[PDB]
Design a protein around this nucleic acid. Structure first.
Length: 234
RNA sequence: GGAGCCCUAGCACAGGUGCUGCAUGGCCGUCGUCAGCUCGUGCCGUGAGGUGUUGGGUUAAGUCCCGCAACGAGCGCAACCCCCG
């Protein structure tokens, strides 16, 4: 089930590379590797979810990041089925602070979505049409998952604040609550709602997301079927 | 008697390739057709400021890509002009 399944092979993050605030989240250093306790998970996986249900109902919004490939393609699908924004490829500065300013790149799509139907293809000639294609392509690609926010979020969900603190400290200046999955390499002082564990365990990912999104759907109504991401493993 | 025009006398005068391009306006060359010059928002710094323009690669090129606390734009490259296929 929860930790029952998790208790399988989905913990323990690296070895002799850590930031000594995970002291209250580590069982033992047995056999060289560092191992994260799971009694504390439940004692921390609750309060997290518990106060999502205080926020998931009142129309709050959530952000999913994942500039690590072994989570990039996962956040992807698990974000649409969630219906909440996401930044799969790579995050870049300002998104939450320069919300107005980043949006012009998104609004651009509106002034670019006019084209692919409207009678200016016959007007707008090719040499800039062609070389704007990839521009439109790479504009959508890096920004799909942000093309659906004009209101600024109500949360942040991060696979690894060590990898994505750059997208956290932005939220931190906005007094916007920040949640994140944390590993032995993390820094569990800046995260508001802690979800410790191995973030680079490809396995310890897919199950985290549905179980995270299951609350999203259950907040909205009618849990469904996710995606058997096991094929994305080996 | 008067307007214009002409010559002769007094004028106000103009006139000078005389001087200073180290006093200037305008115009011209060099770097150089080099590829650089900057702004709005954001971030780092007490602050001047930095980032953006830096790193790898590519091209005639700040041309473009990856990454990057940055994302976009303006002047410039280009292209809109002309001759040839």
């Amino acid at each position: 089930v929860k930790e029952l399944l998790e208790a399988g092979v989905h913990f323990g993050h690296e070895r002799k590379r850590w930031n000594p605030k995970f002291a209250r989240y580590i069982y033992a250093e047995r056999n060289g590797i560092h191992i994260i306790d799971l009694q504390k998970t439940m004692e921390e996986l609750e309060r997290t979810f518990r106060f999502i249900e205080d926020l998931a109902m009142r129309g709050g919004t959530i952000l999913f990041v994942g500039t690590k490939k072994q989570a990039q393609d996962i956040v992807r699908m698990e974000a649409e089925r969630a219906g909440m924004p996401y930044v799969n490829q790579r995050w870049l500065g300002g998104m939450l602070t320069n919300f107005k300013t980043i949006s012009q790149r998104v609004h651009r799509l509106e002034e670019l979505e006019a084209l692919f139907a409207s009678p200016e293809i016959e007007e707008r000639p090719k040499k800039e049409q062609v070389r704007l294609k990839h521009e439109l392509e790479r504009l959508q690609k890096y920004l799909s998952g942000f093309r659906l926010l004009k209101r600024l979020p109500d949360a942040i969900f991060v696979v690894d604040p060590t990898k994505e603190a750059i997208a956290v400290r932005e939220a931190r200046k906005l007094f916007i609550p920040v949640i994140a999955l944390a590993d032995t390499d993390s820094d569990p002082d800046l995260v508001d709602y802690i979800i410790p564990g191995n973030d680079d365990a490809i396995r310890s990912i897919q199950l985290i997301l549905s179980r995270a999104v299951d609350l999203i759907i259950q907040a909205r109504g009618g849990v469904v079927e996710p995606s058997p991401s096991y094929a994305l493993v080996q």
